[model samples]
Target: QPVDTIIYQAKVFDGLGNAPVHMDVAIKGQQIVALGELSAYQATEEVNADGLCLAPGFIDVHTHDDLEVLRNPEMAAKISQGVTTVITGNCGISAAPAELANDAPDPMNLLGEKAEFKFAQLRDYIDAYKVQKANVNVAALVGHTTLRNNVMADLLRPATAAEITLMQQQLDLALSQGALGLSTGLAYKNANQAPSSEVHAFGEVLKKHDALYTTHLRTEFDAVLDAMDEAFAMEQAFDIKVIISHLKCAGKNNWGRAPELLAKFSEQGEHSKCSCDAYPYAASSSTLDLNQVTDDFDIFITWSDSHPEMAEQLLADIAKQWGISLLDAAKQLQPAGAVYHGLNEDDVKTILAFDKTMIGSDGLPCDPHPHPRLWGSFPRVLGHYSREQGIFSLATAIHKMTGLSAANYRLANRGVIKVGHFADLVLFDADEIIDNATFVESALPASGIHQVWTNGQTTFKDKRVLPAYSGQFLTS
Candidate 1:
């Protein structure tokens, strides 16, 4: 048999936190056929890696690209940074099994317009995703808030017995149809009012199906530990794994608590199965909530439905220009998006340095002024934190985005570079890899990605994304 392609003389990091070694890799069809001196093999195409770093492709474990995969399958924002896979339907918002009566609710609108959400079931969304053919592989989670929206008439309170049963039926069907697990945004308005009992009912279904549970805690502020206890209680009840989404200590008052938070997390993790995902930045972005408005930190409004002219202005400035209080100014900009610069830089580094922390962009695709994480999360870790600051070794940085993420998410046969594994790989100049995307200019690509291959086909190279989309819809 003839080899399809061979990459010669590259430094390969096996995605397992091991030191890189110079070797030759051979790819045939969609799998890596051989590695280490492949001098005896012949190939139709040859790539001179020339000492660049060849590692397994990065996996974004948390994201809100539920509908973006269908809208733009090329996925330049992610592919340009060497990310070959994304886990969508994060933060309690999914695109399928959602039937909105009017417009989508507050944070659900962050996925896409009401008109674009027509998938009535998980299978429906999966079918559409396959037909669309994205450039990066995607795995999905069914949203708990989306389930509540589908069956309950009122979201201000807990679901009644009948409503819980209806929601259970929908979740069971979605899990069986191929969703990875269930995710909840207890911090959001629609689902925040539900008591522990209401959300715990779904654990019965999750345990039976052997699925996962992930949550945006009820709060990440002063009562963050209590919220973690709430999430841990579910693990105790169901023996299911839990993932905390974008773990952070928000508000100026909550500063210097990352050590406390991670300590508690580590203590509980010793007895229970739990992990967390964190972006590289200190700021966080999401739907603007009235409860989060404060004078302590800078709040930049990204988009506003009611006050379109107020977009891109600081909330404090907008209030000053309108001659009103900040709360009043925020109220007028209801149904909006915001980036809160409340998190401390020291805390961010503390959390990211933890051994169990996995990497996620948590990027919102639909926002007009999306966060810089949308295009720069992976490279920022490899370049700024690992190489420049020396926070951790280069091997550990690659493991967090690749091997560790794959193991935690239960994604098989994909994270590491092995002979039998699928050919999802990236080649980049580690010395030159730096994220150019900043807060003001959020759409620029990273600096040092030399080439990206998804399933043995090149999708991005020479600073541009190609039309070859070999992405698959991974399932539980």
Candidate 2:
């Protein structure tokens, strides 16, 4: 039988950490039917992928596209950069298993407002997407904070035994329904006071189901080593996998200390089940917090409920205009978003080039003036750092974004460019593929991406998104 789509003679990524192998790939429906010399075979459609690098479509391991995927299914910011799959409900603030009684409460508002939190269970969230599909495949990790918010009367304190039991029961239900497992944002106030023992208890819930525990660690500053210690502690409690979200060394003092952070991972050795994901940019974005306020770096305000007009202005400039301290200015911008230029290129390169690190956009889709990493992260890695800087081979970059992410996240029948795998692929001119999005032009689409396919159907071709958005839920 003839194939539905055949991309001919492209530099195919073999996922073996070797150079890209040029071959013809055939897709029959949603899965790859053949790889090698398929030019002689007949097909319904054939793409001339001459001189383009064809690889598995990227998997965004970290994202805040919890509700945006449902609200806007086209997913322009993501697919424009060649992303085909997204791991949602990251950083301990998921869309479902939550009912925000008080306007989403700080960072949880990063996803959406109170009115947008429509799902109260994991199944509800999954069904919402299944019924109302998006343009990319989505997998969810149940949020620790969302659970705490649902079961606890007061989120500011540690959960009592009874509250923990309820939260555990909810987690069991979500995992049974195919959630990736538990993800925690302990740094957020809603979960900060929660003792390590509570995390230990959560480890128990994950262990029986063979689910993983990922966290946006409580600190990325000088005390980060201790924070890592807490991760190891949880691993000791229950031999569950630990994934550190957006691994970085923030603040001026922490700038050159990425080596020390990596050393901790290195010391852990083969037995350690820990790995990390990071965006390419040197800046980090999040909800405005008083604890992180400082003049050490140029902080750009992305959004603010209290002071709307100051969005995109430097925090220093805002503080100067208001004649207030940086802390005071941050306080005034409560329930807001910011991009802190705290990391240096040296630190970013070191952290990103580490063999175990996976590429994740950590993109916040809700921000009005969101960080450019939201749009350009994956391309920057493939273009700027890999092809341009010569820091690592093109294969290494693709491997990190594709295979490493899939293996670490346990995404099945995906990530590798192999026969029988889902034909989620991207065609790009390697040398020409450079990220065009910058701080000011934060929403600009990337260059050199010729075409993209999600689930054997072309979703993006000739520089624009097509109608065939064959995306589905990857609950396992």
Candidate 3:
């Protein structure tokens, strides 16, 4: 039998947490049918990758790309960085199960406006994907906050017993229809008031579905340890897995706490299944919050509902220009987006260097002045951290984004470059590949990504995301 494509003479990093060896790779349809010396293979297409390194395509395990997959299906930011798969519906803002009323609260706005969220049930999104094809494979998680918005009359208080039951019904409906699991943005005001009992009750629906829980801690400041304990309590009580979304110690005073936190996660991992993801940058982005207002570091505004002109301006500068306090300027820009330069470089390196931490962009696609990680994360790790700073080996860096992420997210038949696995692959000049997208040039394509093939179809190459698509929705 003839092969569909053959890449000749490239170093292969198989994404199995091992070093790479120079080899030839062959593809048949949508899977890697042959590896090693396929020198005599006849193929429909052939690539000369003598000096390039071929590895499993990157998997962005944390994203808010639920609406973006429909709005901008090309996924320029992701595919250009060689991401063939994305896990969306994170930080308590999924695309379905109910209508979002009253102008989509805080981080929900990170998905899109109320008009963009039209799916009233998880099935609606599935139906939409049949028509609105995406550029990367999407695995969705049900948002606890989206469910609350559907069933609760108010959000500033704990859910009543009746409200909890209604939320449970919505969660059950989504899980039964094939949501991966539940995600919570507990740090956001929309979810901050929900008591542990409310989340514990909601876990029953997830438990029945055998689903896991991923949470954005209620606080990243001094009380973050308490926050982790609360999330882990659900895992212990419900006997389920817990993935802490974008684990970090944020606030000036919380600078050197990563070792303690990762120790906690490791201790619990011994007793229960638990993990976390992190972006390569020191800055973290989200909707601007009054609680996060501080003069400790720079806070750049991405977008604002009332002050659109403030996009790309620092909060301090905006406040100075407006002749007001930072908190007052922040309040005026209510329902805005920001990139908080609150994390320590020392801690970022320490946590990212940890074996348990998987690489995730946590990229907010909707922000006009989006964080650089949205386009530059995976490459930054390969280029900046691994290559420049010598943080980890090239294969180890790829493992963090590919194999480790796929395992944590439970993406089947992916992350490894072995035969019979899906043909989602990336080839690049390791010597030349690096992220160019900075907070300044935020949308620039990465350098040295020669080819990207997803589902055995070429989707991106030569600084272009080609016309063919390889993305699909993966439901549990």
* Cα-based TM-score, every candidate: 0.98, 0.97, 0.97
Report the C-alpha lDDT of model 2 over 158-242, residue by residue, as the tens digit: 9998999999998898888879989889888899999998888888789898888889998988898889888877776787788
Q: At residue 82, give the lDDT of candidate 2.
A: 92
Which lDDT value does model 1 have at 204?
Answer: 92
TM-score of 1: 0.98
lDDT of 2: 0.88
Question: lDDT per model, in order?
Answer: 0.91, 0.88, 0.87
- Model 1 C-alpha lDDT per residue in residues 1-476, reported as the tens digit of each score: 78999999999999999999999999999899999998788999999998698999999999888999899999999999899999988878899888889768768887898999989999999999889678999989999899889887788998888899998999999999999899999989899998889889999999998888899999999999999898888887888888998999999999999999887865564456788999999999988888889999999999998999999889999999999998999999987899999999999999999988999999889889988999999999999999999999989999999999888888878989999998999999999999998988998999999999999999999988997889999988
- Candidate 3 or 1, higher TM-score: 1
Q: State the weakest 10-residue window (summed lDDT) of model 3.
A: 263-272
The pairs that clash in candidate 3 are none
Q: Could you tell me which 10 consecutive residues in candidate 2 have the lowest summed lDDT?
A: 264-273
Taking the tens digit of each residue's C-alpha lDDT, what string does model 3 give over 85-131?
Answer: 98878888898876866777666778887898889999999788768
- How many backbone clashes does every candidate have? 0, 0, 0
**Alpha-carbon RMSD of each model:** 1.3, 1.3, 1.5
Off by over 4 Å in 1: 266-270
